[PDB]
Design a protein that fits this description.
- The structure is a homoheptamer.
- In chain A, about 0% of the residues lie in helices and about 60% in strands.
- With about 140 residues, chain A is mainly β.
- The first copy, chain A, has a single domain, classed as Vitelline Membrane Outer Layer Protein I, subunit A, CATH 2.100.10.
- Chain A contains no helices and 13 strands.
- Chain A is globular, with a radius of gyration of 14 Å.
- Strand 11 of chain D pairs parallel with strand 7 of chain F.
- The complex binds alpha-D-mannopyranose (7 copies).
- The site of one alpha-D-mannopyranose (MAN) has 8 residues of chain C, from loops.
- Chain C: It holds the Pfam family Jacalin.
- Chain C: InterPro entries: Jacalin-like_lectin_dom, Jacalin-like_lectin_dom_sf.
Chain lengths: ~140, ~140, ~130, ~140, ~140, ~140, ~140
């Protein structure tokens, strides 16, 4: 692999997903969460040179945030909130970029992971009603 | 295209508008918003070498701000506040320039996007009584 | 010359003063408005004035021969019946002034070497535009 | 030796561990702590080019944090909070790194050590129910 | 003329003073003010290579500040608070230097000038009971 | 000498101590203090290339902090709290290193010394139940 | 002279003192003050290559602070608080060095001088019960 796989965090629940393109980096990512469940529920990704929107999980959240990533822009700082355990859930995401851009999504009330950094390339995990589990993917 | 199209955020309502000029960059942009609705209602854009004011939406807000951009000034930080959904609306905007100029219009109470950065070339979206949706447009 | 947007109303008497070595703003707490502006140019002892100096406050910014505006905010009320309400300026040498009120509308202007001002004034400063060198 | 052994702090209790790979550095670290006991309880570590999770302690706390360390990333700031004496215990860890990443696990109510700095290579200590005692280990 | 004369601010009152020495700079300047009147009352100046004190005004204030200037240190920040009009007065002075030294004397409740900057050469104005009027003078 | 002796501060009481090793710098130092007396009570030092722990004063405090010092790490900031007088006492110690590490032991309610700075080489003073007196020793 | 005499501030009272040594710089200075009188009472100075303490004033204060000055360390910021007048007194001293060291002694309620800066070489003034009057001395 020409990739780094960050630890998938959260539960074993929902349907597996893996978004990646052969010579392709993420150009846009969207987080949808609720104040009712304090969870992530829905994620969309767009890729470079590809108009196609790749979605997973049920967009039942009252908030969304999108981060748009320039062609030369990397993730230097990355934090996923989650609930640990087999019945676990991904609850939150902060990201910060080589250009001072940041996004903050959902809640960080239990467990965290400060992931690897670099050019964000894909995401992997499991999602149904909620984002059960999420790991980021980078280049080397 | 030599253009970067940021995600149009907000609703599908209102009349579509596209402001862009062959070989031209925005030299002035105005945002008009109300405390009453917590929405953007009206945008004006001037372009380099062109005394024409392209306007959209009903200018019924009690506040407006204008950002004038020098020929060599770029947007380095960009956040649009909006209400997601078909029945959506663009609620606020926050720009910061390569010269430390910044403006802030409206409210950021629901969803946000941190857009692409670069030399702002124009805008597109939909507007009637309100700015239903707004996407920014940069040079490569 | 770069001409920044004149912001405020259509009222009062047109003025055009045209490097600025000195600019003074006069405003009041009663009306929360700019009433009067005075300007001196380099190599000229003449004081150019507009608007009625009725206000209880004034500030002066003196500008060194090599000192530019890098930060510029004019506060105003919008519309035909508009007024200029305030001015913040910040220079390339870290100097800054703060005049009047910023309670409704703002413009962040073009930056550079301040060369003049245009607008209209009577009792008040109805409308103000900064002018810079290219 | 090609290594630096930071002082093991805390008590004499629990079962000995020593996790270190010759010619290998710690790529991931997880701290599991409780709000009930105000203690670290469990630690997992993964080395580079090795999916095997080397774990010690009982994972019975309500919180966990995970730091993923990039191949060229070093620890520039390191604080373990502990209770001193024979019946002593490890109670917290704050790690700050050469890229600005930071994790804060546990509580710092009694005693602190600001360790040696560099490339985190391994951990040594004793653990049962609780992390009784922890010492970081770096390269030279 | 090798000199910049900053605008004299304040009133027409008091006895004229003008303190300056050809090829001489201010090595020290003292401001005396009162909480009673909220006015500057007295000013003193020493010049480089000269023990003599050039004074103006009635030293009746409950406070004074002295700023000593090294031979190569200039003024980069200078603000005089004053009451405008013919019956006007000087109320305050903030000065900051090229070495990060600063003094603050009296009050700033009505009018300010942010003056010219550079090597402080002398002072000019009128003073009796109070400082009616003050303009600074710098080298080119 | 090739050493810098910081002022010993505190009282004349206790048993004199000197902890220095020819060709060796302190690689570790531990402060033990109490909330009961608001004094430093006990101090331990380890030296580069030496596993021997040098100790003085009675370890009766409820808090201890340890600072580990990389071989190339100096002290850039040093404050000792103490009571003045013959019957005086050393009450706390704050050290900041050339790598941004810092510690804070005991109390600063009475007198303080901002010491000399450099590579910390030893310590000296007197101790019994308390640290009566502490002086730091640096290389030139 | 190869010396800069900062203004002596405070009163005419007390016994004159002058601390200076020919090719010498202040290596240690102590300031004794009281919360009772809000005055400096006592001052001690040690010089480079000289174990002798030069003292002035009456040590009646409940507070003291000591600054040690490395041989290549200068004063870059200096403030003396004082009561002006014939019956004036020196009330306080703030010093900041070329290495980020700083000390605060006594009180700043009335008058201040921001002195000349450079390598502190002595002090001059008068003292009895109190420090009546204090002026610093630098090298050129
Ligand atoms: O995402 C939460 C939840 O979503 C659905 O309810 C199912 O897919 C579950 O298996 C899953 O755990
Ligand atoms: O701007 C909000 C709203 O304004 C008008 O009522 C119409 O143009 C709608 O389409 C639009 O959605
Ligand atoms: O300045 C406000 C107001 O003042 C004067 O009355 C006139 O010059 C008007 O034209 C103007 O609108
Ligand atoms: O880890 C805390 C505690 O847990 C277990 O009971 C044993 O390992 C003890 O030796 C240990 O002290
Ligand atoms: O300073 C206020 C007042 O002081 C003195 O009385 C005189 O010099 C007046 O001319 C002056 O106006
Ligand atoms: O250390 C504080 C105090 O403790 C012991 O009682 C003795 O050694 C005393 O001399 C000492 O002053
Ligand atoms: O120092 C304060 C005070 O102490 C003594 O009384 C004498 O030295 C006085 O002249 C002096 O003013």
């Amino acid at each position: 692999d020409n990739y780094i796989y960050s630890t998938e965090v959260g539960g074993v629940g929902g349907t597996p997903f893996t978004f990646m393109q052969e010579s392709g980096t993420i150009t846009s990512i969207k987080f949808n969460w609720s104040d009712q469940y304090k969870l992530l529920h829905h994620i969309e990704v767009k890729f470079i040179n590809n108009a196609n929107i790749y979605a997973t999980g049920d967009p039942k959240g009252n908030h969304e945030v999108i981060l748009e990533i320039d062609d030369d822009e990397t993730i230097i700082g990355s934090v996923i909130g989650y609930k640990k355990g087999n019945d676990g859930r991904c609850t939150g995401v902060k990201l910060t970029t080589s250009k001072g851009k940041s996004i903050m999504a959902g809640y960080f009330e239990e467990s965290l992971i400060t992931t690897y950094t670099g050019k964000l390339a894909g995401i992997k995990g499991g999602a149904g009603s909620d984002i059960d589990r999420l790991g980021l993917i980078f280049l080397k």
